[PDB]
């Protein structure tokens, strides 16, 4: 099985640098041209560049040719991409590919000034009813939300986060429940932000 395993992604401040890697296995790496491709949140695929087996030809998409350096180390079966002067627009998932036939799973670059911060959780109180939790001002992604420690799953929608202009994320989770249950049934949203080690249980009522 052809396998391509990326690593080296993370948080980087604007103007910083990062080198990402792609470790190949299950084929003869030294025999192939390799490609890098990226995808910004909610956008399409964009080609970055290609390198031939002996590194004598390296082709870049013209807009990135000064920013980015592709290289490879055949003895190590690894392909590299060096990113410099990164900006917000470079925030993306970065994929390696053997030609365009086999793709890595991706590693993520987030370019941001924001510091790690756990969310504030606010109620979206009911008054079929809907209720929810607003999970506001955290960094970086992800957060997870359950209801009633996972006993409540039907009618739940946990929305994708939005990146606010502060550089911090905000998401909502909501559930629709019978109006008659409201006086009697307890509803607690369980929020876990692993990157800040923050857990909050928020009870929501009328």
């Amino acid at each position: 099985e052809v396998k391509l395993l990326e690593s080296g992604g993370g948080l980087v401040q604007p103007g910083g640098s990062l080198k990402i890697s792609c470790a190949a296995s299950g084929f003869d790496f030294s025999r192939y041209w390799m490609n890098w491709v990226r995808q910004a949140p909610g956008k399409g695929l964009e080609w970055i560049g290609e390198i031939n087996p002996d590194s004598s030809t390296i082709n870049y998409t013209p807009s990135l040719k000064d920013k980015f350096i592709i290289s490879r180390d055949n003895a190590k079966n690894t392909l590299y991409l060096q990113m410099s002067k990164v900006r917000s627009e470079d925030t993306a998932i970065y994929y390696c590919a053997r030609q365009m036939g086999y793709w890595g799973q991706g590693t993520t670059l987030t370019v941001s000034s924001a510091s790690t911060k756990g969310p504030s959780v606010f109620p979206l109180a009911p008054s079929t009813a809907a209720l929810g939790c607003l999970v506001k001002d955290y960094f970086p992604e992800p957060v997870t939300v359950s209801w009633n420690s996972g006993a409540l799953t039907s009618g739940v929608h946990t929305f994708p986060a939005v990146l606010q202009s502060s550089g911090l994320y905000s998401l909502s989770s909501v559930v629709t429940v019978p109006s008659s249950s409201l006086g009697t049934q307890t509803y607690i949203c369980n929020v876990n932000h692993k990157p800040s080690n923050t857990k909050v249980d928020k009870k929501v009522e009328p």
């Binding site: 491709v37 995808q39 399409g44 695929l45 964009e46 080609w47 082709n59 870049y60 998409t61 013209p62 998932i93 994929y95 365009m100 036939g101 086999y102 793709w103 799973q105 991706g106 504030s120 606010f122 109620p123 979206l124 109180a125 079929t128 809907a130 929810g132 607003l134 506001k136 929608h157 929305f159 994708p160 986060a161 939005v162 606010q164 905000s170 998401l171 909502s172 909501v174 629709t176």
Partner: protein, 213 residues
């Protein structure tokens, strides 16, 4: 740069249908056209290379065709694993360029949203900011419009929204919009409303509250 155009960005289908996705190039690309599938988890696979050669591992229900400028991917009978986004790519001239993508989804009957408005909590207001939330629950099709109004002033530039992925059980979408104001702006006004337009509503639905009532 060769510009690749997939002029349908969203395409509805039923399980078992033949589906066709179209791509066109801004100038001739001599059959150097790849098709990619990106699944919901983000995994990318090559399906078809050189216009019509099936990549190893790909079932023959996928096929491709075309030349010069115009190309199509056909899925002969849609399976649930095929609900994904498809991108074309030309590799005739550097830089290689991709289409904007076509996302498949499942057709069902039109269903109007249930709409709910949520005032900001007193807890949040203590910190100096008010978030007002509008929820549009279980609608189809995906296209919907929310307009915020504060004492009849249309609000623009001070909301954000996001939409769930198509539900696996009922094939609907839900949407959440948040309007953000300072506490000081929030307390200067009374009537807060979200007005929702959608194909299932014969005219727009407004949900509103009066602050402090």
């Amino acid at each position: 740069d060769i510009q690749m155009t997939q002029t349908t960005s969203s395409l509805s289908a039923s399980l078992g249908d033949r589906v066709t996705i179209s791509c066109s190039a801004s100038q001739g690309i001599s059959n150097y056209l790849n098709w990619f599938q990106q699944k919901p988890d983000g995994t990318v696979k090559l399906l078809i290379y050189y216009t019509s050669s099936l990549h190893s591992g790909v079932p023959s229900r996928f096929s491709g065709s075309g030349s010069g400028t115009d190309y199509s991917l056909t899925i002969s009978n849609l399976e649930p694993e095929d609900i994904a986004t498809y991108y074309c790519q030309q590799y005739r001239k550097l830089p290689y360029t991709f289409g904007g993508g076509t996302k498949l989804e499942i057709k069902r009957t039109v269903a109007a949203p249930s709409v709910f408005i949520f005032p900001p909590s007193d807890e949040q207001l203590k910190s100096g900011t008010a978030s007002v939330v509008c929820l549009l629950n279980n609608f189809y099709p995906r296209e919907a419009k929310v307009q915020w109004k504060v004492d009849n002033a249309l609000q623009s530039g001070n909301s954000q929204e996001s939409v769930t992925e198509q539900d696996s059980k009922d094939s609907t979408y839900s949407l959440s919009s948040t309007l953000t104001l300072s506490k000081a702006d929030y307390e200067k006004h009374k009537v807060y409303a979200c007005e929702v337009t959608h194909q299932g509503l014969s005219s727009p639905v407004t949900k509103s509250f009066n602050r402090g009532e």
